Motif scaffolding. Structure first.
Motif, PDB file in Angstrom:
ATOM      1  N   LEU A 252       0.110   6.322 -19.578  1.00 53.00           N
ATOM      2  CA  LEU A 252       0.759   6.263 -21.173  1.00 53.00           C
ATOM      3  C   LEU A 252      -0.509   6.806 -22.388  1.00 53.00           C
ATOM      4  O   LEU A 252      -0.320   7.909 -23.794  1.00 53.00           O
ATOM      5  CB  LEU A 252       1.671   6.174 -21.812  1.00 53.00           C
ATOM      6  CG  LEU A 252       3.027   5.887 -20.654  1.00 53.00           C
ATOM      7  CD1 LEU A 252       3.860   5.087 -21.857  1.00 53.00           C
ATOM      8  CD2 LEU A 252       3.200   6.377 -20.441  1.00 53.00           C
ATOM      9  N   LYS A 253      -1.155   5.816 -22.463  1.00 55.56           N
ATOM     10  CA  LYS A 253      -2.451   6.096 -24.289  1.00 55.56           C
ATOM     11  C   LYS A 253      -3.688   5.290 -23.223  1.00 55.56           C
ATOM     12  O   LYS A 253      -3.908   4.465 -22.580  1.00 55.56           O
ATOM     13  CB  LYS A 253      -1.748   4.925 -24.658  1.00 55.56           C
ATOM     14  CG  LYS A 253      -0.415   5.091 -25.134  1.00 55.56           C
ATOM     15  CD  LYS A 253      -0.663   3.978 -26.374  1.00 55.56           C
ATOM     16  CE  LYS A 253       0.257   4.904 -27.503  1.00 55.56           C
ATOM     17  NZ  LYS A 253      -1.300   6.061 -28.896  1.00 55.56           N
ATOM     18  N   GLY A 254      -4.633   5.771 -23.727  1.00 54.38           N
ATOM     19  CA  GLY A 254      -6.198   5.844 -23.622  1.00 54.38           C
ATOM     20  C   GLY A 254      -6.444   6.024 -21.846  1.00 54.38           C
ATOM     21  O   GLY A 254      -5.463   7.120 -21.694  1.00 54.38           O
ATOM     22  N   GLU A 255      -7.540   5.373 -21.675  1.00 53.58           N
ATOM     23  CA  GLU A 255      -8.084   6.281 -20.234  1.00 53.58           C
ATOM     24  C   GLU A 255      -8.384   5.168 -19.437  1.00 53.58           C
ATOM     25  O   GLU A 255      -8.365   4.085 -19.746  1.00 53.58           O
ATOM     26  CB  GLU A 255      -8.765   7.563 -20.244  1.00 53.58           C
ATOM     27  CG  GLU A 255      -8.204   8.756 -21.457  1.00 53.58           C
ATOM     28  CD  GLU A 255      -9.246   9.551 -21.684  1.00 53.58           C
ATOM     29  OE1 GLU A 255     -10.499   9.750 -22.357  1.00 53.58           O
ATOM     30  OE2 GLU A 255      -9.241  10.252 -21.655  1.00 53.58           O
ATOM     31  N   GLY A 256      -8.827   4.876 -18.633  1.00 53.56           N
ATOM     32  CA  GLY A 256      -9.496   4.176 -17.617  1.00 53.56           C
ATOM     33  C   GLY A 256      -9.235   4.747 -15.929  1.00 53.56           C
ATOM     34  O   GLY A 256      -9.567   6.508 -16.115  1.00 53.56           O
ATOM     35  N   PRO A 257      -9.833   3.777 -15.110  1.00 55.17           N
ATOM     36  CA  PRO A 257      -9.604   4.043 -13.585  1.00 55.17           C
ATOM     37  C   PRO A 257      -8.293   4.970 -13.257  1.00 55.17           C
ATOM     38  O   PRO A 257      -7.122   4.747 -13.069  1.00 55.17           O
ATOM     39  CB  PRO A 257      -9.686   3.092 -13.347  1.00 55.17           C
ATOM     40  CG  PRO A 257     -10.089   2.307 -13.868  1.00 55.17           C
ATOM     41  CD  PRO A 257      -9.409   2.437 -15.187  1.00 55.17           C
ATOM     42  N   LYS A 258      -8.751   6.397 -12.172  1.00 55.51           N
ATOM     43  CA  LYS A 258      -7.392   6.483 -11.550  1.00 55.51           C
ATOM     44  C   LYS A 258      -6.333   5.610 -10.662  1.00 55.51           C
ATOM     45  O   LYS A 258      -7.241   5.115 -10.377  1.00 55.51           O
ATOM     46  CB  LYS A 258      -7.809   7.697 -11.216  1.00 55.51           C
ATOM     47  CG  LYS A 258      -8.787   7.647 -10.088  1.00 55.51           C
ATOM     48  CD  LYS A 258      -9.144   9.111  -9.105  1.00 55.51           C
ATOM     49  CE  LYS A 258      -9.839   8.156  -7.909  1.00 55.51           C
ATOM     50  NZ  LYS A 258     -11.882   7.926  -8.314  1.00 55.51           N
ATOM     51  N   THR A 259      -5.285   5.135 -11.190  1.00 56.35           N
ATOM     52  CA  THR A 259      -4.565   4.015 -10.187  1.00 56.35           C
ATOM     53  C   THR A 259      -3.456   4.296  -9.350  1.00 56.35           C
ATOM     54  O   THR A 259      -2.996   5.931  -9.439  1.00 56.35           O
ATOM     55  CB  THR A 259      -4.285   3.399 -11.384  1.00 56.35           C
ATOM     56  OG1 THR A 259      -3.173   3.720 -12.330  1.00 56.35           O
ATOM     57  CG2 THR A 259      -5.521   2.370 -11.552  1.00 56.35           C
ATOM     58  N   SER A 260      -3.359   4.395  -8.436  1.00 61.23           N
ATOM     59  CA  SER A 260      -1.633   5.063  -7.474  1.00 61.23           C
ATOM     60  C   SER A 260      -2.112   3.280  -6.799  1.00 61.23           C
ATOM     61  O   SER A 260      -2.631   2.548  -6.602  1.00 61.23           O
ATOM     62  CB  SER A 260      -2.863   5.852  -6.910  1.00 61.23           C
ATOM     63  OG  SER A 260      -3.696   5.556  -5.886  1.00 61.23           O
ATOM     64  N   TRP A 261      -1.192   3.684  -5.337  1.00 62.81           N
ATOM     65  CA  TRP A 261      -0.286   2.546  -4.786  1.00 62.81           C
ATOM     66  C   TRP A 261       0.212   3.663  -3.344  1.00 62.81           C
ATOM     67  O   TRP A 261       0.729   4.427  -3.996  1.00 62.81           O
ATOM     68  CB  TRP A 261       0.204   2.125  -5.438  1.00 62.81           C
ATOM     69  CG  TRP A 261       2.034   1.371  -6.064  1.00 62.81           C
ATOM     70  CD1 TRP A 261       2.033   1.920  -7.723  1.00 62.81           C
ATOM     71  CD2 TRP A 261       2.867   2.180  -5.638  1.00 62.81           C
ATOM     72  NE1 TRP A 261       2.853   2.590  -7.713  1.00 62.81           N
ATOM     73  CE2 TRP A 261       3.723   2.578  -6.384  1.00 62.81           C
ATOM     74  CE3 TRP A 261       3.369   2.239  -4.049  1.00 62.81           C
ATOM     75  CZ2 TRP A 261       5.516   2.739  -7.112  1.00 62.81           C
ATOM     76  CZ3 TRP A 261       5.333   2.807  -4.253  1.00 62.81           C
ATOM     77  CH2 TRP A 261       5.301   2.966  -5.184  1.00 62.81           C
ATOM     78  N   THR A 262       0.777   2.983  -2.577  1.00 65.41           N
ATOM     79  CA  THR A 262       1.537   2.470  -1.697  1.00 65.41           C
ATOM     80  C   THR A 262       2.042   1.674  -0.802  1.00 65.41           C
ATOM     81  O   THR A 262       1.735   0.937  -1.586  1.00 65.41           O
ATOM     82  CB  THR A 262       0.426   3.796  -0.295  1.00 65.41           C
ATOM     83  OG1 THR A 262      -0.180   2.966   0.385  1.00 65.41           O
ATOM     84  CG2 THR A 262      -0.397   4.611  -1.322  1.00 65.41           C
ATOM     85  N   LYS A 263       3.259   2.367   0.054  1.00 65.12           N
ATOM     86  CA  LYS A 263       4.123   1.629   0.980  1.00 65.12           C
ATOM     87  C   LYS A 263       4.276   1.914   1.883  1.00 65.12           C
ATOM     88  O   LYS A 263       4.013   3.275   1.910  1.00 65.12           O
ATOM     89  CB  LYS A 263       4.891   1.005  -0.322  1.00 65.12           C
ATOM     90  CG  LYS A 263       5.185   0.321  -1.663  1.00 65.12           C
ATOM     91  CD  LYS A 263       6.043  -0.692  -2.409  1.00 65.12           C
ATOM     92  CE  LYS A 263       6.226  -0.934  -3.489  1.00 65.12           C
ATOM     93  NZ  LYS A 263       4.975  -1.692  -4.145  1.00 65.12           N
TER      94      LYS A 263
END
Length: 137
Positions: A100-111
């Motif tokens: 939503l705000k700022g930046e940082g590493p690309k995150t993701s998840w799986t199940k």
């Protein structure tokens, strides 16, 4: 072959390294690794709609989503994000996130449900993948 149920963790690989990529300092990373030994996951699935509750000894979060429909949650390290979940096969979903705000590493998840009856969750931060194996309570 169905995600719904109560799951309890039996393996947790690469958690600390993920948190390192997310800027967690050393002492809190170790306390998070200890706390991750009590991860419990409760899933209620109906069609392509999901309620998911992830809990530890002292902390619990509930997620609610429909495949294909953007929704808002928090990254592993607590930063709010907009998430979008898609199917990759009969028993695997992938979720892309964007901050939503700022930046940082690309995150993701799986199940994923294995045919051995396990639930496998991965969480990715840039080039680091944490893998967590769960079995039905």
């Amino acid at each position: 072959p169905n995600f719904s149920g109560n799951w309890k963790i039996i393996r947790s690989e690469n958690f600390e390294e993920l948190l390192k990529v997310l800027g967690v300092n050393v002492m809190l990373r170790k306390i998070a690794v200890a706390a991750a030994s009590k991860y419990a996951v409760e899933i209620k699935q109906e069609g392509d709609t999901f309620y998911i509750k992830v809990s530890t000894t002292v902390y619990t979060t509930e997620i609610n989503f429909k495949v294909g429909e953007e929704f808002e949650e928090q990254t592993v390290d607590g930063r709010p994000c907009k998430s979008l979940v898609k199917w990759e096969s009969e028993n695997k979903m992938v979720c892309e996130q964007k901050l939503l705000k700022g930046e940082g590493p690309k995150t993701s998840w799986t199940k994923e449900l294995t045919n051995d009856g396990e639930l496998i969750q991965t969480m990715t931060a840039d080039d680091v993948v944490c893998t967590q194996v769960f079995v039905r309570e």
